[PDB]
From a paper:
In human cells, the SKI complex functions mainly in co-translational surveillance-decay pathways, and its malfunction is linked to a severe congenital disorder, the trichohepatoenteric syndrome. SKIV2L activity has now been shown to act primarily in exosome-mediated degradation during co-translational mRNA surveillance pathways (Tuck et al., 2020) by extracting mRNA from stalled 80S ribosomes (Zinoviev et al., 2020). For clarity, we will refer to the human orthologs of the yeast Ski complex subunits as hSKI2 (SKIV2L, ∼137.8 kDa), hSKI3 (TTC37, ∼175.5 kDa) and hSKI8 (WDR61, ∼33.6 kDa).
To recapitulate this scenario in our system, we reconstituted an 80S-CrPV-IRES assembly with wild-type hSKI, incubated with ATP for 15 min and collected cryo-EM data on a Titan Krios microscope. In the corresponding reconstruction, the interaction between 80S and hSKI2 is essentially unchanged with respect to that observed in the presence of a prehydrolytic ATP mimic. Unlike hSKI in isolation, this alignment was dominated by the ribosome-bound hSKI2 in the open state, leaving the separate hSKI gatekeeping module unresolved. The cryo-EM reconstruction of the open state shows that the RNA in the helicase channel extends with well-defined density for three nucleotides more at the 3′ end (N7, N8, and N9) than detected in the closed state. Thus, when hSKI is in the open state as observed in the active assembly, the 3′ end of the ribosome-bound RNA traverses the helicase core and occupies the space where the wedge of the gatekeeping module was bound in the closed state.
Residue numbers in the entry: 282 to 529, 546 to 1246
The structure:
Amino acid sequence: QWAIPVDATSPVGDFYRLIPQPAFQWAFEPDVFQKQAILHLERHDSVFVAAHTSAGKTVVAEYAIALAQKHMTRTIYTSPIKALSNQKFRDFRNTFGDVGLLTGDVQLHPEASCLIMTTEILRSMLYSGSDVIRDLEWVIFDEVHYINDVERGVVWEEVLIMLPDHVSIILLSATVPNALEFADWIGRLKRRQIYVISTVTRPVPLEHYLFTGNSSKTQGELFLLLDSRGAFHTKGYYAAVEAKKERMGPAQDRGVYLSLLASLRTRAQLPVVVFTFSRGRCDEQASGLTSLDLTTSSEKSEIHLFLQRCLARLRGSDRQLPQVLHMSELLNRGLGVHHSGILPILKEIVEMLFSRGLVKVLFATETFAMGVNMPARTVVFDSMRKHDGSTFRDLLPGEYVQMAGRAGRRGLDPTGTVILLCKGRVPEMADLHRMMMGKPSQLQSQFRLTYTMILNLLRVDALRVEDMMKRSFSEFPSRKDSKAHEQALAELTKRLGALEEPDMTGQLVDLPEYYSWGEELTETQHMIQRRIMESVNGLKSLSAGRVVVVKNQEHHNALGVILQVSSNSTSRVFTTLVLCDKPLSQDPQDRGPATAEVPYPDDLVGFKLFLPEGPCDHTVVKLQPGDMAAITTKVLRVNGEKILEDFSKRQQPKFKKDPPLAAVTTAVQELLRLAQAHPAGPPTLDPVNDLQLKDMSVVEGGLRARKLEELIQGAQCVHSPRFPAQYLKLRERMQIQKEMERLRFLLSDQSLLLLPEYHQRVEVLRTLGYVDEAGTVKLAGRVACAMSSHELLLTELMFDNALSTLRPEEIAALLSGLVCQSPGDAGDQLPNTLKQGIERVRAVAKRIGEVQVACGLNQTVEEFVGELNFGLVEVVYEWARGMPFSELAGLSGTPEGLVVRCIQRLAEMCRSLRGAARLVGEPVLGAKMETAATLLRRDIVFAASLYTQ
RNA sequence: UUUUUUUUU
């Protein structure tokens, strides 16, 4: 089975009869699904929790560590966000003993038994041994719905395969629908059974209101469009639209926010989290608001004392700059901002002052929605559309669920209200329906090949790269029933030894090739037949007065004339009068499966016109497009309406004995004479030479058919006495051979979709000097292995003598072009040396893109070289001399958070280069970069975290 | 006009 879907609610009745000494004891009672998850964690199973609220999963995520600390063993807790894995660090150090943390720069206590890591580091310490993996029991994958990401979903699937069998896995999730085809994949990729627990109905449910502006001075009206019972209320939506109708940027929005906070302050719904969707819009209304003073005296005193004790670590001028003062003023009134263009010390101050209720309004953004939990009372949105990938799209359902989920608090309020704040135009409830309710999202797999995996797998001998592709989740549906495919192959290989070898010497010489001619020609006509009904020109021909040949299990190439064409052009049902033999029977028991009709030449040229052996009766059948063998050229102007008013009238069981109508008799006699008048079927309405079409495929098909008919009309096998038996036996073996071939291909190695891209990348890799022939890593490959990003470009640049001959205060500016991810530009007040190094680096990028595009890869040289985005070179060059921050702030118009982030991101390459400069043997760039690194990190750019020390 | 991660030796 490999995946056990344990029932969420039914099984557990006795949680304390067994397990009477829980490894951890809370201050309240764990509910049913957490009881079941702990019940399965007791027996050393591997649960897959899928819950809503972040505080329901960490009861398991710390009971597993209480068990880990009880046994002296070790556990690795992995979270994707670098800032989310610090408050967890604080809570695990406060709750019990030693918990080490490892991130891009922090290495706090790398010897504990709760190392907290980002998965991109565990993927880096799986390629080597690292001697920690010998001691694990549990690996708590925290947020496992980042597989659906496009730029990091490959890490979780590179990790989940290489993990050995003895290491148990815990997968916390966010209630995705398709949990049973993923836990089954992990269950049968390893050989352990996996239990799935999924919950709904988070406590303290939430009412989704809608606030539309009116009488912005005091009046606030809230319309209910969703309730505690899931019932959609359209009445509120309608009320909103009329409310917008009677009335029919910053000065109005200020009154909108003062009306919202005026109707909110009258009640106790104070701790309100506004979600804005752009940092300029986020700080604009916070600047323009400018008078609330929502804070009393004692909380003002506590805020002031706390804020100076926390800020007084850093030096003097560094605590007096515009943002710090402005933010302190806002906090003094009780207002905060939490966007991504602010210093991390202020994101941290706002979050640590929001978890104790000393701030009342937060103009947060999605980073607060993901990186922390800290539940608040009332969440208010600000818009419906965001700008993700330059398409300025509408917000999709999965996100909304999370922010709405952090609306209710736990036992400090009855429920939680989520207020949407549509202001510009009507809410357009139609898309609100599928966004605000809807199955959250499936679980995809964004697997792709990078150079790092290829190098770190060629480096090792016992692992092959196609192994990783076969074990990949994007191959799971294909490779699901692999044991059944191989068993079918192995049990039909036995069957192959069975059939006798026939003798074709003489009259049977061309029997196999003839066989081939029979199938393909037939297939061709069907393709041509498809090219007949799919055409718009057939759609003009398809009308009353059309005779067709009908071919299905009931009618065997019986000639019919269509009475009418259905008005519904989707399901083409044709009421058509077709001649058939008068039924000389009423009992289905004499009818049985008969001999498989061998194709004779008389059967393979056109359609053998059936001549009824009995009297010429009629039927009127409701025909499909696929049941008609041919569209005949004849135009019989018969009037369908009277024939319908006669057949449908007569088809009363009581009216089966009506006298025939003249139109029916005339149609039957004319059809019968036409049946006699063509020896094997009249010519069809030619697709090209009669319908005036120009598709090449139909012309090749028609000429191939003509050549095959001429060839088939001379076969010698048709005259042999034992033609049918040997022939049918050959048919059976040929089908078995074809299905075996397809079966082996599906089990073969060419099935992998990305294999040609693997070959092309390997070839381009070997064209540079990184891998010898027959796939053995060379020295440049081993250099490019241990690199963070852009390994190829960095190692090629390092090996060449471009950078070697520059100043240490200039190499930082040269490397600043790889990291900024910001709108870029050139400079004016720059030395000459930087100004020629930029063309050299860009020329190297052009060379790399030209060797990339000259191998088979599809990435144009311009799109590859456009990743090089200089424009922080001057700022980093001035910063890495001793120049203080204020001049940097003045210099140019970019928010000082996206600059400080770039500076640590640069200090992590002038530290990931210590590993390659010490391995190639070039100790003078190492001795310049180990200076250029210690001269760049001195102050609030690299200020230590608050809840770290 | 979003967010975003890549230890040690």
